[PDB]
UniProtKB/Swiss-Prot annotation:
UniProt protein name: Thermolysin
Organism of this sequence: Bacillus thermoproteolyticus
Cofactor: Ca(2+); Zn(2+)
One BP term from GO: proteolysis
Binding site for Ca(2+) 2: 138, 177, 185, 187, 190
Amino acid sequence: ITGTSTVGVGRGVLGDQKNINTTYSTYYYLQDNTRGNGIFTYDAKYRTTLPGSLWADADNQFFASYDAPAVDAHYYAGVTYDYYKNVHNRLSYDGNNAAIRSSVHYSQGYNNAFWNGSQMVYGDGDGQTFIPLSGGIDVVAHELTHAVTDYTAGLIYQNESGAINEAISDIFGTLVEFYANKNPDWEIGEDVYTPGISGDSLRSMSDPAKYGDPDHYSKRYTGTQDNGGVHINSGIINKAAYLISQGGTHYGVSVVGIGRDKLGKIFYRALTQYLTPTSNFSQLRAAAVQSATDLYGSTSQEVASVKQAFDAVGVK
Ligand SMILES: [Ca+2]
Ligand SMILES: [Ca+2]
Ligand SMILES: [Ca+2]
Ligand SMILES: [Ca+2]
Ligand SMILES: [Zn+2]
Protein backbone atom coordinates (compact mmCIF):
# COMPACT_ATOMS: atom_id res chain seq x y z
CA ILE A 1 0.00 0.00 0.00
CA THR A 2 0.94 3.68 -0.34
CA GLY A 3 2.07 5.34 2.88
CA THR A 4 4.85 6.78 5.02
CA SER A 5 7.91 4.65 5.82
CA THR A 6 8.61 4.28 9.52
CA VAL A 7 10.15 1.95 12.10
CA GLY A 8 8.30 -0.18 14.61
CA VAL A 9 9.46 -2.43 17.43
CA GLY A 10 8.53 -5.95 18.45
CA ARG A 11 9.58 -9.30 19.88
CA GLY A 12 10.42 -12.36 17.82
CA VAL A 13 9.64 -16.04 18.35
CA LEU A 14 12.60 -16.50 20.69
CA GLY A 15 11.59 -13.45 22.74
CA ASP A 16 14.28 -11.12 21.41
CA GLN A 17 13.45 -7.47 20.73
CA LYS A 18 14.14 -5.99 17.30
CA ASN A 19 13.23 -3.02 15.14
CA ILE A 20 11.32 -3.62 11.91
CA ASN A 21 10.57 -1.44 8.88
CA THR A 22 6.88 -0.67 8.49
CA THR A 23 4.56 1.57 6.46
CA TYR A 24 1.97 3.93 7.91
CA SER A 25 -1.41 4.57 6.29
CA THR A 26 -4.17 4.60 8.93
CA TYR A 27 -2.68 1.33 10.21
CA TYR A 28 0.99 0.35 10.44
CA TYR A 29 1.69 -2.44 7.93
CA LEU A 30 4.52 -4.94 7.72
CA GLN A 31 5.77 -3.43 4.49
CA ASP A 32 9.47 -2.58 4.27
CA ASN A 33 10.09 0.01 1.53
CA THR A 34 13.83 0.26 2.19
CA ARG A 35 14.72 -2.92 0.31
CA GLY A 36 14.15 -3.26 -3.43
CA ASN A 37 10.50 -3.23 -4.45
CA GLY A 38 9.67 -4.06 -0.85
CA ILE A 39 9.26 -6.85 1.68
CA PHE A 40 5.67 -7.72 2.57
CA THR A 41 4.48 -9.97 5.39
CA TYR A 42 0.95 -11.40 5.49
CA ASP A 43 -1.34 -13.04 8.04
CA ALA A 44 -2.76 -16.36 6.76
CA LYS A 45 -5.00 -16.53 9.86
CA TYR A 46 -4.60 -20.30 10.34
CA ARG A 47 -6.08 -20.92 6.86
CA THR A 48 -4.40 -22.30 3.72
CA THR A 49 -5.55 -19.53 1.38
CA LEU A 50 -2.58 -17.45 0.22
CA PRO A 51 -1.22 -14.91 0.70
CA GLY A 52 -3.83 -13.81 3.20
CA SER A 53 -4.03 -10.21 4.42
CA LEU A 54 -1.12 -7.76 4.55
CA TRP A 55 -0.21 -7.53 8.24
CA ALA A 56 -1.84 -4.49 9.85
CA ASP A 57 -1.18 -3.21 13.37
CA ALA A 58 -2.76 -0.26 15.18
CA ASP A 59 0.22 1.11 17.15
CA ASN A 60 3.45 -0.02 15.44
CA GLN A 61 4.35 -2.14 18.49
CA PHE A 62 4.49 -5.90 17.95
CA PHE A 63 4.79 -7.55 21.37
CA ALA A 64 1.76 -9.87 21.24
CA SER A 65 2.43 -13.60 21.04
CA TYR A 66 0.42 -13.68 17.80
CA ASP A 67 2.82 -11.08 16.33
CA ALA A 68 6.06 -13.02 16.96
CA PRO A 69 6.16 -15.15 13.76
CA ALA A 70 5.41 -12.08 11.63
CA VAL A 71 8.15 -10.02 13.27
CA ASP A 72 10.79 -12.65 12.52
CA ALA A 73 9.58 -13.49 9.00
CA HIS A 74 9.68 -9.79 8.16
CA TYR A 75 13.02 -9.12 9.84
CA TYR A 76 14.92 -12.17 8.60
CA ALA A 77 13.69 -11.69 5.04
CA GLY A 78 15.36 -8.30 5.30
CA VAL A 79 18.62 -9.75 6.60
CA THR A 80 18.67 -12.30 3.79
CA TYR A 81 18.05 -9.55 1.22
CA ASP A 82 20.98 -7.62 2.72
CA TYR A 83 23.24 -10.67 2.50
CA TYR A 84 22.63 -11.23 -1.21
CA LYS A 85 22.95 -7.53 -2.00
CA ASN A 86 26.06 -6.77 0.07
CA VAL A 87 27.97 -10.03 -0.42
CA HIS A 88 26.98 -11.15 -3.92
CA ASN A 89 25.71 -7.92 -5.48
CA ARG A 90 22.37 -9.57 -6.21
CA LEU A 91 19.20 -7.48 -5.95
CA SER A 92 16.49 -9.73 -4.47
CA TYR A 93 15.89 -13.28 -5.70
CA ASP A 94 15.37 -12.41 -9.38
CA GLY A 95 18.26 -9.97 -9.54
CA ASN A 96 15.89 -7.11 -10.34
CA ASN A 97 14.57 -6.28 -6.86
CA ALA A 98 11.41 -8.39 -7.01
CA ALA A 99 9.11 -7.84 -4.02
CA ILE A 100 9.57 -10.46 -1.29
CA ARG A 101 6.37 -11.84 0.25
CA SER A 102 5.89 -14.10 3.27
CA SER A 103 2.77 -15.45 4.97
CA VAL A 104 2.76 -16.65 8.59
CA HIS A 105 0.21 -18.55 10.68
CA TYR A 106 -0.34 -20.89 7.74
CA SER A 107 -2.82 -23.67 8.62
CA GLN A 108 -2.98 -25.14 12.15
CA GLY A 109 -0.08 -26.82 13.94
CA TYR A 110 1.74 -26.96 10.61
CA ASN A 111 5.33 -28.22 10.95
CA ASN A 112 6.68 -26.88 7.67
CA ALA A 113 7.89 -23.80 5.83
CA PHE A 114 8.21 -23.60 2.05
CA TRP A 115 8.53 -21.53 -1.12
CA ASN A 116 5.45 -22.05 -3.31
CA GLY A 117 6.96 -20.60 -6.47
CA SER A 118 5.76 -17.08 -5.69
CA GLN A 119 6.24 -16.53 -1.95
CA MET A 120 7.45 -17.97 1.35
CA VAL A 121 5.01 -19.69 3.72
CA TYR A 122 5.52 -20.46 7.43
CA GLY A 123 3.58 -22.77 9.72
CA ASP A 124 3.39 -22.24 13.50
CA GLY A 125 4.52 -25.77 14.29
CA ASP A 126 2.72 -28.09 16.72
CA GLY A 127 4.66 -26.77 19.71
CA GLN A 128 6.37 -30.14 20.17
CA THR A 129 8.33 -30.85 17.01
CA PHE A 130 8.55 -27.20 15.95
CA ILE A 131 7.73 -23.70 17.20
CA PRO A 132 6.95 -20.99 14.56
CA LEU A 133 9.39 -21.77 11.74
CA SER A 134 10.13 -18.13 10.89
CA GLY A 135 12.04 -17.98 14.18
CA GLY A 136 15.01 -19.67 12.56
CA ILE A 137 17.17 -17.44 10.40
CA ASP A 138 18.64 -20.44 8.59
CA VAL A 139 15.10 -21.62 7.78
CA VAL A 140 14.08 -18.23 6.32
CA ALA A 141 17.31 -17.99 4.31
CA HIS A 142 16.87 -21.61 3.18
CA GLU A 143 13.46 -20.73 1.77
CA LEU A 144 14.45 -17.47 0.07
CA THR A 145 17.39 -19.28 -1.51
CA HIS A 146 14.95 -21.67 -3.22
CA ALA A 147 13.63 -18.55 -4.97
CA VAL A 148 17.15 -17.60 -6.03
CA THR A 149 17.74 -21.10 -7.39
CA ASP A 150 14.44 -21.05 -9.30
CA TYR A 151 15.51 -17.86 -11.10
CA THR A 152 19.02 -19.05 -11.85
CA ALA A 153 20.06 -22.70 -12.21
CA GLY A 154 16.45 -23.90 -12.02
CA LEU A 155 17.45 -27.26 -10.54
CA ILE A 156 14.56 -29.72 -10.91
CA TYR A 157 13.26 -30.84 -7.50
CA GLN A 158 13.93 -34.54 -7.96
CA ASN A 159 16.77 -37.04 -7.53
CA GLU A 160 20.31 -35.64 -7.68
CA SER A 161 19.37 -32.24 -9.10
CA GLY A 162 16.86 -31.89 -6.27
CA ALA A 163 19.45 -32.85 -3.66
CA ILE A 164 21.72 -30.11 -5.03
CA ASN A 165 18.80 -27.68 -4.89
CA GLU A 166 18.32 -28.59 -1.21
CA ALA A 167 22.03 -28.38 -0.34
CA ILE A 168 22.29 -24.92 -1.91
CA SER A 169 19.48 -23.74 0.35
CA ASP A 170 21.14 -25.27 3.43
CA ILE A 171 24.53 -23.83 2.47
CA PHE A 172 23.32 -20.27 1.97
CA GLY A 173 20.91 -20.59 4.87
CA THR A 174 23.96 -21.27 7.02
CA LEU A 175 26.06 -18.52 5.44
CA VAL A 176 23.28 -16.02 6.18
CA GLU A 177 23.18 -17.27 9.78
CA PHE A 178 26.91 -16.50 10.01
CA TYR A 179 26.40 -13.14 8.28
CA ALA A 180 23.89 -12.09 10.94
CA ASN A 181 26.19 -13.52 13.62
CA LYS A 182 23.19 -15.03 15.42
CA ASN A 183 24.73 -17.93 17.38
CA PRO A 184 26.06 -19.35 14.07
CA ASP A 185 26.70 -23.05 13.51
CA TRP A 186 26.64 -25.69 10.78
CA GLU A 187 23.34 -27.20 11.92
CA ILE A 188 19.96 -26.62 10.27
CA GLY A 189 16.86 -25.40 12.12
CA GLU A 190 18.24 -25.73 15.63
CA ASP A 191 16.46 -22.59 16.87
CA VAL A 192 12.93 -23.81 16.13
CA TYR A 193 13.29 -27.59 16.34
CA THR A 194 12.11 -29.60 19.38
CA PRO A 195 11.88 -26.84 22.01
CA GLY A 196 11.85 -29.57 24.65
CA ILE A 197 15.24 -30.93 23.57
CA SER A 198 18.45 -28.90 23.55
CA GLY A 199 21.45 -29.43 21.30
CA ASP A 200 19.69 -31.08 18.36
CA SER A 201 18.57 -29.97 14.90
CA LEU A 202 16.79 -31.21 11.78
CA ARG A 203 19.96 -31.68 9.72
CA SER A 204 23.69 -31.33 10.29
CA MET A 205 26.17 -30.12 7.67
CA SER A 206 29.22 -30.91 9.82
CA ASP A 207 28.08 -34.49 10.42
CA PRO A 208 24.97 -35.46 8.38
CA ALA A 209 25.19 -39.04 9.68
CA LYS A 210 24.27 -37.81 13.15
CA TYR A 211 20.65 -37.80 11.97
CA GLY A 212 20.91 -40.71 9.57
CA ASP A 213 21.71 -38.75 6.42
CA PRO A 214 24.48 -39.95 4.05
CA ASP A 215 27.93 -38.35 4.20
CA HIS A 216 29.39 -40.29 1.26
CA TYR A 217 28.12 -41.03 -2.26
CA SER A 218 28.31 -44.77 -1.59
CA LYS A 219 25.57 -44.32 1.02
CA ARG A 220 23.19 -42.35 -1.19
CA TYR A 221 19.47 -43.10 -1.07
CA THR A 222 18.16 -44.58 -4.31
CA GLY A 223 14.48 -44.93 -3.40
CA THR A 224 11.45 -42.91 -4.47
CA GLN A 225 10.46 -41.29 -1.18
CA ASP A 226 11.05 -37.57 -0.67
CA ASN A 227 11.22 -37.01 -4.44
CA GLY A 228 14.20 -39.34 -4.68
CA GLY A 229 15.69 -38.31 -1.34
CA VAL A 230 16.22 -34.59 -1.93
CA HIS A 231 16.40 -33.85 1.81
CA ILE A 232 18.45 -37.00 2.41
CA ASN A 233 21.14 -36.98 -0.28
CA SER A 234 21.70 -33.26 0.28
CA GLY A 235 23.82 -34.44 3.20
CA ILE A 236 26.51 -35.57 0.76
CA ILE A 237 26.82 -32.09 -0.71
CA ASN A 238 26.39 -30.35 2.66
CA LYS A 239 29.33 -32.36 4.01
CA ALA A 240 31.44 -31.39 0.99
CA ALA A 241 30.63 -27.71 1.54
CA TYR A 242 31.47 -27.97 5.24
CA LEU A 243 34.84 -29.53 4.38
CA ILE A 244 35.66 -26.88 1.78
CA SER A 245 35.08 -24.18 4.38
CA GLN A 246 36.31 -25.74 7.63
CA GLY A 247 38.58 -28.52 6.40
CA GLY A 248 39.15 -31.90 7.99
CA THR A 249 39.79 -35.54 7.17
CA HIS A 250 36.79 -37.55 6.01
CA TYR A 251 37.03 -41.24 5.13
CA GLY A 252 40.80 -40.91 5.03
CA VAL A 253 40.84 -37.92 2.67
CA SER A 254 42.31 -34.68 4.02
CA VAL A 255 40.92 -31.28 3.05
CA VAL A 256 42.47 -27.88 3.78
CA GLY A 257 39.69 -25.43 4.63
CA ILE A 258 39.52 -22.11 2.75
CA GLY A 259 36.85 -20.33 4.82
CA ARG A 260 33.17 -19.39 4.58
CA ASP A 261 33.60 -16.32 2.37
CA LYS A 262 35.34 -18.26 -0.39
CA LEU A 263 32.86 -21.13 -0.05
CA GLY A 264 30.06 -18.66 -0.70
CA LYS A 265 31.80 -17.08 -3.68
CA ILE A 266 32.53 -20.45 -5.28
CA PHE A 267 29.02 -21.83 -4.84
CA TYR A 268 27.27 -18.61 -5.84
CA ARG A 269 29.24 -18.54 -9.09
CA ALA A 270 28.53 -22.21 -9.75
CA LEU A 271 24.82 -21.61 -9.12
CA THR A 272 24.52 -18.53 -11.32
CA GLN A 273 26.91 -19.42 -14.16
CA TYR A 274 27.35 -23.17 -14.58
CA LEU A 275 24.51 -25.22 -13.10
CA THR A 276 21.45 -26.16 -15.16
CA PRO A 277 18.04 -27.71 -14.37
CA THR A 278 19.32 -31.29 -14.74
CA SER A 279 22.79 -31.02 -13.19
CA ASN A 280 23.85 -34.05 -11.15
CA PHE A 281 26.49 -34.39 -8.41
CA SER A 282 29.31 -35.06 -10.87
CA GLN A 283 28.37 -31.93 -12.80
CA LEU A 284 28.23 -29.92 -9.57
CA ARG A 285 31.81 -30.95 -8.87
CA ALA A 286 32.84 -29.77 -12.35
CA ALA A 287 30.95 -26.51 -11.86
CA ALA A 288 32.54 -25.87 -8.46
CA VAL A 289 36.03 -26.60 -9.76
CA GLN A 290 35.52 -24.31 -12.75
CA SER A 291 34.18 -21.55 -10.49
CA ALA A 292 37.15 -21.77 -8.14
CA THR A 293 39.41 -21.76 -11.21
CA ASP A 294 37.77 -18.59 -12.55
CA LEU A 295 38.18 -16.85 -9.21
CA TYR A 296 41.53 -18.07 -7.90
CA GLY A 297 43.43 -19.79 -10.71
CA SER A 298 43.86 -23.41 -11.77
CA THR A 299 46.87 -23.98 -9.49
CA SER A 300 45.38 -22.33 -6.41
CA GLN A 301 44.83 -23.85 -2.98
CA GLU A 302 41.14 -23.05 -3.43
CA VAL A 303 40.78 -25.31 -6.47
CA ALA A 304 42.77 -28.02 -4.70
CA SER A 305 40.45 -27.93 -1.67
CA VAL A 306 37.32 -28.17 -3.82
CA LYS A 307 38.68 -31.30 -5.51
CA GLN A 308 39.69 -32.84 -2.18
CA ALA A 309 36.28 -32.16 -0.62
CA PHE A 310 34.41 -33.90 -3.42
CA ASP A 311 36.90 -36.79 -3.39
CA ALA A 312 36.23 -37.14 0.34
CA VAL A 313 32.49 -37.61 -0.20
CA GLY A 314 33.00 -39.91 -3.18
CA VAL A 315 31.80 -37.60 -5.95
CA LYS A 316 33.85 -38.00 -9.12
CA1 LIG B 1 0.41 -3.60 18.13
CA1 LIG C 1 22.47 -21.24 15.27
CA1 LIG D 1 21.84 -23.16 12.04
CA1 LIG E 1 15.61 -28.78 20.04
ZN1 LIG F 1 14.32 -26.75 0.87
